[PDB]
Design a protein around this ligand. Sequence first.
Ligand code: GNP
Ligand code: MG
Ligand code: MG
Ligand code: MG
Ligand code: MG
Ligand code: MG
Ligand code: MG
Ligand code: MG
Ligand code: MG
Ligand code: MG
Ligand code: MG
Ligand code: MG
Ligand code: MG
Ligand code: MG
Ligand code: MG
Ligand code: MG
Ligand code: MG
Ligand code: MG
Ligand code: MG
Ligand code: MG
Ligand code: MG
Ligand code: MG
Ligand code: MG
Ligand code: MG
Ligand code: ZN
Lengths: 104, 88, 129, 14
Amino acid sequence: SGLGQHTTTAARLYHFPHGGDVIDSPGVREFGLWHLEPEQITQGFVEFHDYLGLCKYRDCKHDTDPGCAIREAVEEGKIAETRFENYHRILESMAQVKTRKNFS
Amino acid sequence: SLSTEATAKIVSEFGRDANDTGSTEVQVALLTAQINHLQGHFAEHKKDHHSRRGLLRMVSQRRKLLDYLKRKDVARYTQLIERLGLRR
Amino acid sequence: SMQDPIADMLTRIRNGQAANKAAVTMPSSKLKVAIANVLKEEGFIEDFKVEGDTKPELELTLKYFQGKAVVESIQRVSRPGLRIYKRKDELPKVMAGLGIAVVSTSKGVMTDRAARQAGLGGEIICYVA
Amino acid sequence: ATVNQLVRKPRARK
RNA sequence: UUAGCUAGUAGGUGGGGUAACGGCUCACCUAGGCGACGAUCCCUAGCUGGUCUGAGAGGAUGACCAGCCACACUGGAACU
RNA sequence: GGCGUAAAGCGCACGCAGGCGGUUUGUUAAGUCAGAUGUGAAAUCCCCGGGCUCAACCUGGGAACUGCAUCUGAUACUGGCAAGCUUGAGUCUCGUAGAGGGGGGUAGAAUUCCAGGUGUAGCGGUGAAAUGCGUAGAGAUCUGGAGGAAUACCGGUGGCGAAGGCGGCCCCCUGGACGAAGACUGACGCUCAGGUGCGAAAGCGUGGGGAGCAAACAGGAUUAGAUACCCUGGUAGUCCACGCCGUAAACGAUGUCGACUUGGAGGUUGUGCCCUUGAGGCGUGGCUUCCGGAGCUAACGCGUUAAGUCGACCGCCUGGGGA
Ligand SMILES: Nc1nc2c(ncn2[C@@H]2O[C@H](COP(=O)(O)OP(=O)(O)NP(=O)(O)O)[C@@H](O)[C@H]2O)c(=O)[nH]1
Ligand SMILES: [Mg+2]
Ligand SMILES: [Mg+2]
Ligand SMILES: [Mg+2]
Ligand SMILES: [Mg+2]
Ligand SMILES: [Mg+2]
Ligand SMILES: [Mg+2]
Ligand SMILES: [Mg+2]
Ligand SMILES: [Mg+2]
Ligand SMILES: [Mg+2]
Ligand SMILES: [Mg+2]
Ligand SMILES: [Mg+2]
Ligand SMILES: [Mg+2]
Ligand SMILES: [Mg+2]
Ligand SMILES: [Mg+2]
Ligand SMILES: [Mg+2]
Ligand SMILES: [Mg+2]
Ligand SMILES: [Mg+2]
Ligand SMILES: [Mg+2]
Ligand SMILES: [Mg+2]
Ligand SMILES: [Mg+2]
Ligand SMILES: [Mg+2]
Ligand SMILES: [Mg+2]
Ligand SMILES: [Mg+2]
Ligand SMILES: [Zn+2]
């Protein structure tokens, strides 16, 4: 009605007419962020690399901390606010996935 | 079942005296007049299946009482079946 | 209902023997007298009396050892659902000859020990163990 | 359990 | 997870028939017969005295021995 | 051998065939029992022997073949006939209690809709918000009317009914249950495969009906997505008539009937007697819950309403999955 179905299975291999291979993917709605620290979440975005080391404190949550230069870059308009509100949504997702426990 | 005038009269009709009230032929007539009393009731009240259980109780009770007189004395049996209009 | 009154008789004996009752009562009949008189002559009970003629009521006096059950267990064998009959040489013993088996024949009610001199067979009533 | 039941149908051997 | 089956079918008369009784057969007359105590239909199988197992009750089976029935390439028929 | 929870008591009831049946006497000798005759081929097996050097094996006689038929007997029990008896089961009268069923009226709150009045910026909703509604005056309040469905308190392991179930009041028709005192029929009984009817709700057919609630669905949050949860609405259905469907964790997860076996806390419903010397004292039946002895049970627990000891009959189960 308003959704999508995952009919094709995990991965089937074929070849390009020129070169290389293809890998199909499942219909995936999962987000596994159990890997590393939220310092690596800062490294997961390209334009946020060049703006680090510009805020007030040496450690920063970037949501409730006064004087965040990353937040000033969003207010300037060089970074869209759709990416910034989704960025702390990732950080607030780790406040709710972490709850029970999981370790490899 | 019935009133006092309807019950005590039929005992005097089929019994030898006023004390002849426990006999089987009186007990058939107590059920015969009651089923004939309930002919117009269940015609109007076909959705009353709970009183129908009391109706089917008395039909099965009358059938058991006719089988006792039939197996013992058939002379008194052939009198009552036409005197009350039985055997259909 | 009361369709096996001998089994109803054995029910009242086994209960009062275990429940330390001194005496029991039951409705009498001709056959219940012909069994309790045998048990009186075989040391299992003490005495029996009749009461009433239009309602025959039989009574039994119990029997104990030091408050211990003399009749330890009794087993109804034949029944209205299944009749059991044996011959003069197929009479079963109770506890290899210790207990007695009440067998009613044409010469009255007797035991299998008494049926050896009688040489008859018939209906097994109960295993008086 | 009843002997009179087994008159109608005996015990079903597998 | 087979409930109705059956018209020579059930019975009777008379004729015919075989070594013997009989729907065994024929004409006529009757509408009964069978069946929930398993008729009928389907599948499987020779049976029994026995063998084997089992404390016994039972259970499984029917080779060699013996008894009986059926069969002799398939089907049908009669003679002697 | 089992069926309260391991697999299993049909959802319940009526009832034919069938099985079974109180007590007393007479009769029959059917069943059964005793004895005898005939028969149950031989071989096999069993008992004692003999023979082959032994054993296997062969073989003498006996036993066995628990079978069937007939005859003579015995009469306690079962069966049949005959006459009974009353404690089983029924009948009458006087009564009591009950949401038992069906039909027809009727009441007042509450919900929503509509009409009018006063009255103003939010109402509504949630963890927080939004959808939605409202300056055409919502919401709130008051008056009045319409329609629909259900009956607060009473009300409680309380009552009734075979069960599912059944709840405002009143009338009418009607069913069963129980108690008291006697009278009366005389086993008229118990049980049930097929058969018969009842049987929660959903759903189906035809025609009505429409508040509220509410599958599907609409919309908004939630979310990775929301299909569900939450919220604002909303059709079928829920209501009635007429049928059909006959399945439920239809459960007390215990089929019915009868007989007995120490008892308590109570509840409900009667009845008998008693300085009525209080709605009390003393008994005594019907129904019902919680404890608990013996006993039983795999344990849990049951335990005078048994799952204790027994009888009568019926249903059902045979490793799990497939199913
Ligand atoms: N109109 C249109 N339809 C398209 C286009 N691309 C794909 N579709 C349709 O979209 C549907 C989904 O395609 P599909 O490739 O099966 O999706 P998927 O992501 O592989 N599904 P899955 O998760 O099962 O593997 C198909 O019906 C396809 O025809 C396009 O460019 N235009
Ligand atoms: Mg009444
Ligand atoms: Mg002829
Ligand atoms: Mg040969
Ligand atoms: Mg041969
Ligand atoms: Mg077992
Ligand atoms: Mg189970
Ligand atoms: Mg039930
Ligand atoms: Mg004589
Ligand atoms: Mg022989
Ligand atoms: Mg010999
Ligand atoms: Mg020999
Ligand atoms: Mg030797
Ligand atoms: Mg007799
Ligand atoms: Mg109202
Ligand atoms: Mg009399
Ligand atoms: Mg429809
Ligand atoms: Mg909804
Ligand atoms: Mg409808
Ligand atoms: Mg079912
Ligand atoms: Mg329970
Ligand atoms: Mg104890
Ligand atoms: Mg208890
Ligand atoms: Mg199986
Ligand atoms: Zn910062």
